[PDB]
Amino acid sequence: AQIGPVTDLHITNANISPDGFSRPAVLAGGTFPGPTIAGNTGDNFQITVFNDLTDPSMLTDTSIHWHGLFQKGTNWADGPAFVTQCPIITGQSFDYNFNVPGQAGTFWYHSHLSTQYCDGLRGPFVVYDPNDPNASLYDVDDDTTIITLADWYHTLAQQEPIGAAITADATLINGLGRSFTNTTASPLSVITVQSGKRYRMRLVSISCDPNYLFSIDGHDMTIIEVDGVNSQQLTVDQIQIFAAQRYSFVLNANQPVGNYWIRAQPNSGGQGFDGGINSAILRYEGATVEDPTTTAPTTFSNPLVETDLHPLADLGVPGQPFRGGADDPLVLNLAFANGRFSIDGVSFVPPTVPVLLQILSGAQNAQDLLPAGSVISLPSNSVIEVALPAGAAGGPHPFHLHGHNFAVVQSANNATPNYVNPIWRDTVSIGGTGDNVTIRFTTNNPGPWFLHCHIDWHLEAGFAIVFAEDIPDTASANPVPQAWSDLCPAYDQAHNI
Numbered sequence: 001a002q003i004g005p006v007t008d009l010h011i012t013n014a015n016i017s018p019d020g021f022s023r024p025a026v027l028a029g030g031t032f033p034g035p036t037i038a039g040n041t042g043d044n045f046q047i048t049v050f051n052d053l054t055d056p057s058m059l060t061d062t063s064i065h066w067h068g069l070f071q072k073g074t075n076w077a078d079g080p081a082f083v084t085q086c087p088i089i090t091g092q093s094f095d096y097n098f099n100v101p102g103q104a105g106t107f108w109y110h111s112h113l114s115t116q117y118c119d120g121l122r123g124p125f126v127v128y129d130p131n132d133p134n135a136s137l138y139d140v141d142d143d144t145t146i147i148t149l150a151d152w153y154h155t156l157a158q159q160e161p162i163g164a165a166i167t168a169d170a171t172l173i174n175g176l177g178r179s180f181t182n183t184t185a186s187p188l189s190v191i192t193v194q195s196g197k198r199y200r201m202r203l204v205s206i207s208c209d210p211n212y213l214f215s216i217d218g219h220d221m222t223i224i225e226v227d228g229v230n231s232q233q234l235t236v237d238q239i240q241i242f243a244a245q246r247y248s249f250v251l252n253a254n255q256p257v258g259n260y261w262i263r264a265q266p267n268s269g270g271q272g273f274d275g276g277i278n279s280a281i282l283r284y285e286g287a288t289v290e291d292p293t294t295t296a297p298t299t300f301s302n303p304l305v306e307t308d309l310h311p312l313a314d315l316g317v318p319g320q321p322f323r324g325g326a327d328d329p330l331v332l333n334l335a336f337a338n339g340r341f342s343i344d345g346v347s348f349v350p351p352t353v354p355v356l357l358q359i360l361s362g363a364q365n366a367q368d369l370l371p372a373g374s375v376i377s378l379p380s381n382s383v384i385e386v387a388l389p390a391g392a393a394g395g396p397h398p399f400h401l402h403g404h405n406f407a408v409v410q411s412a413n414n415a416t417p418n419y420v421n422p423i424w425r426d427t428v429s430i431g432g433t434g435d436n437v438t439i440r441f442t443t444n445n446p447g448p449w450f451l452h453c454h455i456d457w458h459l460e461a462g463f464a465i466v467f468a469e470d471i472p473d474t475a476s477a478n479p480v481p482q483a484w485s486d487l488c489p490a491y492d493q494a495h496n497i
Ligand SMILES: *[C@@H]1O[C@H](CO)[C@@H](O[C@@H]2O[C@H](CO)[C@@H](O)[C@H](O)[C@H]2NC(C)=O)[C@H](O)[C@H]1NC(C)=O
Pocket: 323, 324, 330, 331, 387, 389, 434, 435, 436, 438
């Protein structure tokens, strides 16, 4: 069952074996992935997070972010540790109480402390639209049509050795999959459809790192939603999905009754499908209970290309139709050297006092805010452009902005900008060397919003900045509950800070 919009959510340690290998984990709701949190557009979510963690090898503190939800007026509920709150300590709970006006689509939630979400604290978050303009395109849309793609590691996140390459040990589709090495024939996920029906498949990357080439043998996929934003219908036969992105696609169960491979090929880790790695099963009702015998093509006919996507609504692009045609045009210098990422020469290291708390205590320019050089102010009610030129090692980097979605004025692997009708989304691959992926948005949401690569290993290694949007109005716009004010004193006392 789905939970919410008012629910408790306990965060615990447990052993799991999603690929046949047992390891301890950090779990929401006792499962990997965590349970789906759901409601309708405009609802009040009240998620009381109980931190019951006791194993320090995966950190006993926690903080949860609701990825893609704008948190307007509730910046304190956004979740990034040391940006909007101090972590919740073990044995305590915290009510994330917020509303989702004006949003409907496919989101997710995850730990936003260190690399803890890699250890298991990740799950889907769906905001349904009772008046969805896409409703007539499908028959079924429920918990059975959510498809999560996850990387899974045998080594604990905190225990990944300094100086060694980090790659995953299994791809998990709906929480199950097989290990790349020492593969055993552990159970694969089954997604069941009925011949003749149409399904809104909500594809969620809960990845800590790899992008996936997602496909379904024998089928094609009609994209209708991108990171919460309704799209015009775009039919593809493969989707390259980067960490933290979401798509909804219509799956028409229009092939013969049978079994079909679902494929999710990561860009690192195991290549191919030997032994049933990187795989799940699409099973039609009435099919034999057996593995598919289908193959992929050598070459896909209609892969997703981001510039092919367009909003369903007339969203346009704010500003003027040329580079720099914004009130606050920025170009970030995104770099990597010697194990650390930097943005404009500064590697992100979380501050002792959360950025929001520093602002509420009266720090009122970005040069006053810690970490020094990691907080950039944005003016209110302004068109912002951010160019994100690629080149830094470890790409392609999926950059994500909290508190906002954005127009993708320029996409990976294509030098031509689009000032007319590009897709809007919240996490975008910045592409390859020489690219100039560029985003735009308007500043109508006062508070400190994290901008970072969503490869969690890269965030940990510093690939982030904070946009302190409308510092002057942050305090009036974001009244804080007493329980939030209590977080840092409790955290600092527990940690002898
Ligand atoms: C990406 O686009 C930005 C503009 O959005 C380019 O920024 C300009 O950079 C040059 C020097 O490289 C400066 O003289 C300008 O002031 C910048 N802003 C402009 C022209 O609007 C940036 O060079 C581009 N980067 C890449 C790698 O193509």
